[PDB]
UniProtKB/Swiss-Prot annotation, chains A, B:
Name of the protein: Maleylacetoacetate isomerase
Cofactor: glutathione
Gene name as annotated: GSTZ1
One GO MF term attached to the UniProt entry: glutathione transferase activity
N6-acetyllysine: residues carrying this PTM: 28
GO terms under biological process: cellular detoxification; glutathione metabolic process; L-phenylalanine catabolic process; tyrosine catabolic process
């Protein structure tokens, strides 16, 4: 049975939990809380299951896969239904473009011990500028790719990266007023079951 | 005919040019120099080119694709031969894991709009630490995935991200002695034609 190594409000592991929920794969979560006295990701316990020192990893089918997006595409390739990528290559590129922008273009610029090394004073204003310049970019894309959801009228890998990123912007008190397509898409997905049963307000690494 | 927007030492456009060369797609490059006069990256010309203000964008088949890895996977799906991804889904995940680690995990901590923010003095100590902690992670993945190349004995998308990242490490005078699998694989790819005709010293945005 699949095992996932995750951090309850880690944006990137929420992505995998949504994908597991959408595919209907039962999975065990193994907590690793990442900031309690340098967290268990500076445990050099977690730093060679996946040497990147970070979230997530999925053991499945007798292998271990790191990187949220690589895991999600693995699940897409091996459990097709329901599809997380459209069939048309041109729209698949919109999905990957958007997810890469969030996963590689926005999230790295706001990751947390990115901002332990910033200097506490500049932690937030750098994450805010990062999310605003990204959301400035993203809204612009979604206004032509989006339909009901980020790409068209089906939930895709792009939406799995949207919801956790929008959750961070709110945590950083970033004003989504300028971003109506992002806001609207986010509301429509948060009413779906798989974005709820996976929510950081619904997961394992988690005290009272 | 396909148009690509690139910058001489831009790592992520070097990735796309390697994939075009491997796929045998002749393409026009259009330079956009990203440091000349605040660079062509802060031109709000280039900032809806690719809305995240960065390299690359590929015009092809009547659409616009941003994000190197999203462009590469489009090229893989629409020009199958030669494969940039193995057929076995388990091996596709190692490719994707490695590529995401370089593209989203290593380069974002040392990119140009990264260390505008650092401050002149610790620019270089930070980029070196980022690459060393990333390559420390990467070398260990490569020790079970690698064969002749990053994954097995065929060139994959993982190798297209390796070569430009290794170029970054060398520019930052990062000592590759601890990383023998990376150096060996990098040399074996550097003798291949598609990693040459794409090489920075073989592209358009060209002063002396």
């Amino acid at each position: 049975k699949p095992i996932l190594y995750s951090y309850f409000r880690s944006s990137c592991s929420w992505r995998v939990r949504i994908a597991l929920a959408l595919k209907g794969i039962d999975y065990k979560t193994v907590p690793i809380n990442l900031i309690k006295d340098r967290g268990q990701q500076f445990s050099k316990d977690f730093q060679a299951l996946n040497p990147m020192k970070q979230v997530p990893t999925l053991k499945i089918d007798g292998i271990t896969i790191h990187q949220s997006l690589a895991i999600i595409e693995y699940l897409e390739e091996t459990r097709p239904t329901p599809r997380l990528l459209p069939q048309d290559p041109k729209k698949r590129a919109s999905v990957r473009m958007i997810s890469d922008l969030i996963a590689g273009g926005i999230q790295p610029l706001q990751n947390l011990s990115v901002l332990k090394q910033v200097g506490e004073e500049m932690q937030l204003t750098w994450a805010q500028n990062a999310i605003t310049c990204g959301f400035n970019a993203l809204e612009q894309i979604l206004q032509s790719t989006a339909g009901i959801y980020c790409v068209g009228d089906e939930v895709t890998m792009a939406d799995l990266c949207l919801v956790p990123q929008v959750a961070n912007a709110e945590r950083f008190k970033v004003d989504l007023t300028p971003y109506p397509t992002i806001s609207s898409i986010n509301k429509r997905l948060l009413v779906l079951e798989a974005f709820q049963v996976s929510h950081p307000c619904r997961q394992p690494d988690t005290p009272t």
